[PDB]
């Protein structure tokens, strides 16, 4: 039953996870400057996107804000002006491929070539698979993953030429494990994780060392995106603090909280029937 | 998170003794209505013959009219007259129209093997946006429409089997296949979510299986040297998994250990691997 092999792999995962916390704590990493960088933040009209925007504004980055909610993106750009940075706000629908391209040409003309992309815009329609609407399933994929492909394909050429860039994919713990009443959302978030993992490998194979990639995978955050969790509740400030620390230290996989990867790692040692029961309990 | 880390460990070692250290029963698929997508070649074609040998009622789907007809002809030689159809699994409306025809002519599908898949190998900047959309429409979106249509009958009877044919690319991203890996990650996520949702809905008699093989010699991608897998081995692992209700079927089975040892891949080995990846891309 590969029991000896599996006990040794369990101990290695545990020892490695322990050493990973030690290094995180005792060996502090150098943290880069994002000042002057052209930062595009999608879904910047609320929550994680709005707070992330303010962290870049504080660090004197050049900002390009995108969101479908015209009032929200304008409200974020107004607070950026108070923080000392005049942001370039646009109301762009990240589900639309043509709209993304048209708006990125406007960004090239008015602002310049984007250097850091935070693909934060996302959508969810909680329901059991048989109660879902097919239009909503398509929309979940168009925003949560297909939009990432079109924004990256458009901005990547300049980053490749310069061997300098940063692609931030905002995925979720739902990109690592599936949960009830969120099947299309988990599937689209798994695709976002896969996009980041593949992009990271391809840039490495192409020798584009200077183009960094980061993937944000937080647990339930109190932003109104969803009203209640599936399996503590995070505050937006903690997530943004972890995201900025990860971007500046070129962290590839940013779990929020950092230790949730221990749970995810240990679950790989369980049958799927057991892990599914596990993520459905409330003791 | 101390307490949950411990409940995970006690849970791991509990299932190590439950069925990991304990006369395996294999079910009968005779008389079952089996739908196999992408049945005109490779894995789908061989899987079809295994169900025909086990006296299952067969419904075959493929875009390639000649290939699906060739498979249905060999089924007749095996003793089963199959119902072959030319259906494009990327088209939501075509899937629904064809499934109404299957309901009228054959009946309610009991086992679904979502095997049809597509790939357009290229580095992200050389990909065609139509091909990126097509990769998602076939590899993941088609799984959603086929399942939503066939699931109600399986729910009513508490009996069924949803087989998701994903790939090792659903567990790790590889260069020059970013949209393909992203769509395969979504397929894995769909299976994981479906498994949890069925458990939450109390419909566990609808079993789920996810096939994740390494490179198979079927012509899906061109051959590069590196060990190659044969279609017969994959189909043998798939059938054994379906009959024994295996949820995660890696081919070969031990590639789950390889995925777990990725953090330990020596820098020298990564340099050779991402050197053969481009040596074969150039072909
Ligand atoms: N909230 C959580 O619990 C949670 C957890 C993990 C991951 N995430 C992810 O974090 C990201 C941000 O979510 P949030 O928690 O800040 O939610 P939020 O509701 O506060 O903000 C999301 C923003 O994205 C915008 N947006 C949605 N669709 C868009 C589109 N088509 N084009 C442009 N903008 C669009 C919305 O209008 C909104 O301003 C999402 O990708 C979400 O999946 C959220
Ligand atoms: N070949 C491998 O190396 C490999 C490895 C892991 C996983 N897989 C997966 O296994 C599955 C089967 O691939 P294969 O290796 O048997 O390849 P294959 O080329 O031999 O056969 C795939 C079949 O799917 C059909 N198909 C493609 N698009 C379709 C559509 N829109 N509608 C209906 N049918 C369609 C094709 O006509 C073909 O007959 C795919 O999902 C693939 O991603 C393949
Ligand atoms: C602190 C650490 C302790 C140090 C001591 C180390 C001792 C030895 C350790 C051994 C570790 C071995 O682990 C290997 C894990 O590998 C898993 C990596 O998975 C990543 C996926 O990448 C695989 C890519 O495949 C490479 C081959 O590419 C060619 C494939 O050709 C076939 C397909 O061709 C068509 C594709 O287009
Ligand atoms: C006991 C235990 C079980 C699971 C985990 S986990 O970190 O693997 C985990 C996995 C998912 C899968 C969801 C959640 S959740 O409860 O936070 N639920 C949500 C997570 C994300 C989202 C979203 O992105 O909208 C909406 C709910 C969490 C904590 C940690 C500890
Ligand atoms: C040294 C080493 C490295 C990786 C592995 S692995 O088993 O984790 C692995 C991971 C992926 C990620 C791909 C592959 S691959 O080389 O088989 N590549 C392909 C896999 C699937 C497909 C396809 O689905 O078409 C097309 C190529 C493999 C062996 C085992 C040993």
Numbering used by the authors:
A (entry chain B): 1 to 231, 235 to 286
B (entry chain A): 1 to 22, 28 to 229, 233 to 291
The publication says:
Hydroxysteroid 17-beta-dehydrogenase 13 (HSD17B13) is a hepatic lipid droplet-associated enzyme that is upregulated in patients with non-alcoholic fatty liver disease. Recently, there have been several reports that predicted loss of function variants in HSD17B13 protect against the progression of steatosis to non-alcoholic steatohepatitis with fibrosis and hepatocellular carcinoma. Here we report crystal structures of full length HSD17B13 in complex with its NAD+ cofactor, and with lipid/detergent molecules and small molecule inhibitors from two distinct series in the ligand binding pocket. The overall structure of each HSD17B13 subunit could be divided into two parts: (i) the catalytic core domain (residues 29–259) that contained the cofactor binding site and the catalytic center and (ii) the membrane anchoring domain that consisted of the N-terminal helix (N2-P28) which was highly hydrophobic and a C-terminal proximal helix-turn-helix motif (P260-N286) which formed an amphipathic patch on the protein surface.
Based on findings from dog HSD17B13 crystals, we changed four surface residues distant from the active site of human HSD17B13 to those of dog protein at the dog HSD17B13 crystal interface (Q60K, I62R, R71H, and E161K, human mutant) to improve the resolution of the human HSD17B13 crystals and obtained useful crystals of the human mutant HSD17B13 in complex with NAD+ and compound 2 (compound 2-human). The crystal of the compound 2-human HSD17B13 contained four HSD17B13 dimer complexes in the asymmetric unit, with 2 occupying all the protein subunits. In some subunits, long rod-shaped electron densities were observed together with those of 2 at the binding sites. We built detergent C12E8 molecules into these densities, but these densities could be from the alkyl chain of the solubilized endogenous phospholipids as well. Like 1, 2 binding also displaced the C-terminal peptides in HSD17B13. In detergent co-existing binding sites, these peptides, as extensions of the P274-N286 helices, shifted positions relative to those of the apo dog HSD17B13 to interact with bound C12E8 molecules. Like 1, the negatively charged carboxylate of 2 formed hydrogen bonds with S172 and Y185 and contacted the positively charged nicotinamide ring of NAD+ at closest distances of 3.1 Å to the C4N and C5N atoms. The terminal tosyl group extended toward the lipid membrane, interacting with the helix-turn-helix motif. While the terminal fluorophenyl of 1 pointed toward an opening that faces solvent, this opening was sealed by the extended P274-A291 helix in the 2 complex with detergent. Observations of lipid/detergent molecules in human HSD17B13/2 complex interacting with the N-terminal helices and the helix-turn-helix motifs directly demonstrated that these structural elements are indeed responsible for membrane anchoring.
